[PDB]
Structure 1
Amino acid sequence: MDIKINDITLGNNSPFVLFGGINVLESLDSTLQTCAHYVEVTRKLGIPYIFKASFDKANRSSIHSYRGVGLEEGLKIFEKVKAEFGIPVITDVHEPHQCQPVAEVCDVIQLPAFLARQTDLVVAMAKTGNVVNIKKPQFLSPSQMKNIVEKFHEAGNGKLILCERGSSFGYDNLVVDMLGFGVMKQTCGNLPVIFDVTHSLGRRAQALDLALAGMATRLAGLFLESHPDPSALPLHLLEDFLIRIKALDDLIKSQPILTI
């Protein structure tokens, strides 16, 4: 099942969409400069692009490290991004009351992994009618995603994207099960599946190999963070990186699926 996001077609058999951006919105000018670089590189390579940032990063290393600009100023900045670049945007919500104001501005609203079973939030998100990105908790299996999906459907919203971010593998370590992509496709009605490579690892050097492995399984999109300069990609390496992802994606998508 495909989802239309303005003029973008998101689907497991369409050219991959980059959900790309930064961790926390904490500025106007710098946000715009980083977005500008994403837009320039993705336009150059012809890759559909959705800008990502959180306005409230609620799980930070220290309690007084900056949470971000917050909802009201964050939405102002997202409005500027859309008016300048003409692209869709994505951001996460944390409480039901945020869902309406965020959804009026942002094309995709995201359910944080740690809140993915919070029924009140799921219902409030569903009722916006907005496209939703569901972050898969590291402690949840791929077959258990249908249960979150069912809840969204019961509440009247089937415009859902499932986002892989790795699975707990012993202490303080994540593994990405490449077989989980297929399980999610087969058990949740072939909804768009995307891959958060940034939150799947702890080391920067391995991002390309891990991203290519995931995209080899035939996915709707790649979800990453960069920094203007730990796992975030150096922004200057974006073009070299995306050249490789596009190469593989273009190959994989050009062939029809082979049933075993």
Structure 2
Amino acid sequence: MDIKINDITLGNNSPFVLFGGINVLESLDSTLQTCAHYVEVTRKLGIPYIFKASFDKANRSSIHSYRGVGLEEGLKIFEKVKAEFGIPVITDVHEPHQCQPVAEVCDVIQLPAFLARQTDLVVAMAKTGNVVNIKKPQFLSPSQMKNIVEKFHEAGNGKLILCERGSSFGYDNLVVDMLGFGVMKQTCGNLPVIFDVTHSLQTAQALDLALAGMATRLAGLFLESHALPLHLLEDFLIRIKALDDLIKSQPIL
């Protein structure tokens, strides 16, 4: 199943879509600057692009840690990103009441991995009618992703993206099961599957891991820069596009 996001066709047999951006919104000017680098690089490379950022870091290690600009500022910054660049955007939501107002602005709304079993958040997200990015919890097997998809379907929203971010591997370490992509395709109605390489690394390896995941034939790549050094983005993406073009050119089977 493909999903149209404005003029972008997102699908597991379509050219890969870059979901790219930053950890958290910090100011308008820094956001616009970073986003302009992404747009410029992806435009020239011919890669469909969706800008990513959180408006709030809800689970930092200290109650005093900087959390980003917050929701009201955040949606103001997103509105300007959309106006200036004409691209879709994606952000995460942490509380049910945030969903509809966030969804008025942000094209794709994201269910954080920790909150996949917050059933009222699922319901509130589904009710917006927006495209949804479901972050696969590190504690959830690829065959059980269907359980989350089921909930969204029962709540009336079938515009769902499945986002790999690694699986718990002993303590304080993650492993990406390259077979999980295919399991998710087979068991969740071939919904778009994307790969968050950035959060998968938590514990030069970013390129190798990204290439490996995209070799399994995926709708998109999800990443953050500062995270990849921003100036390496073009060279990084040249590689990814080379591999994606090759895989997508091969008949399935």
With the length of structure 2 as denominator, give the TM-score of the two structures. Answer: 0.99
- Distance between the aligned counterparts of 1:223 and 1:142, measured in 2? 18
- Distance between the aligned counterparts of 1:87 and 1:13, measured in 2? 22
- The offset of 1:65, in angstroms, is 1.6
- The offset of 1:109, in angstroms, is 0.1
- Distance between the aligned counterparts of 1:35 and 1:234, measured in 2? 14
Contact 2:174 2:203 in 1 (8 A): no
**2:190 corresponds to which residue?**
190
Contact 1:45 1:243 in 2 (8 A): yes
The SS at the match of 2:50 is strand
- The offset of 1:61, in angstroms, is 3.1
* Number of equivalences: 253
- The offset of 1:59, in angstroms, is 1.6
- Distance between the aligned counterparts of 1:91 and 1:99, measured in 2? 11
Give unmatched runs, 5+ long, in structure 1: none
- The offset of 1:256, in angstroms, is 1.1
- Distance between the aligned counterparts of 2:60 and 2:164, measured in 1? 21
Contact 2:172 2:203 in 1 (8 A): no
The SS at the match of 2:163 is strand
- Distance between the aligned counterparts of 2:133 and 2:146, measured in 1? 14
- Distance between the aligned counterparts of 1:63 and 1:198, measured in 2? 24
The SS at the match of 2:204 is helix
- Distance between the aligned counterparts of 1:167 and 1:160, measured in 2? 20
Q: Percent identity?
A: 99
**1:236 corresponds to which residue?**
231
- Distance between the aligned counterparts of 2:203 and 2:245, measured in 1? 24
Contact 2:13 2:219 in 1 (8 A): yes
Contact 1:204 1:233 in 2 (8 A): no
- The offset of 1:193, in angstroms, is 0.1
- Distance between the aligned counterparts of 2:106 and 2:204, measured in 1? 32
- The offset of 1:204, in angstroms, is 11
Distance 1:238 1:138, change over 3 A: same
**1:61 corresponds to which residue?**
61
CA offsets 1:149-183 (integer angstroms, 9 cap, x no match): 00000000000000000000011000000000000
- Distance between the aligned counterparts of 1:63 and 1:20, measured in 2? 28
- The offset of 1:21, in angstroms, is 0.1
- Distance between the aligned counterparts of 1:215 and 1:61, measured in 2? 32
Contact 2:113 2:136 in 1 (8 A): yes
Contact 1:20 1:225 in 2 (8 A): yes
- The offset of 1:63, in angstroms, is 2.2
Runs of 4+ with deviation above 3 angstroms = none
- The offset of 1:29, in angstroms, is 0.4
**1:89 corresponds to which residue?**
89
Distance 1:117 1:57, change over 3 A: same
For the pair 1:255 / 2:253, whether they are aligned, the reply is: no
- Distance between the aligned counterparts of 1:80 and 1:164, measured in 2? 29
The SS at the match of 2:140 is coil
The SS at the match of 1:35 is helix
- Alignment RMSD, CA only? 1.0
For the pair 1:128 / 2:123, whether they are aligned, the reply is: no
With the length of structure 1 as denominator, give the TM-score of the two structures. Answer: 0.96
Contact 1:114 1:137 in 2 (8 A): yes
- The offset of 1:253, in angstroms, is 0.2
Deviates further, 62-71 or 111-120: 62-71
**1:207 corresponds to which residue?**
206
CA offsets 1:213-232 (integer angstroms, 9 cap, x no match): 000000000000001xxxx0
The SS at the match of 2:179 is helix
- Distance between the aligned counterparts of 2:206 and 2:62, measured in 1? 26
- Distance between the aligned counterparts of 2:163 and 2:113, measured in 1? 9
Distance 1:171 1:145, change over 3 A: same
- The offset of 1:144, in angstroms, is 0.5
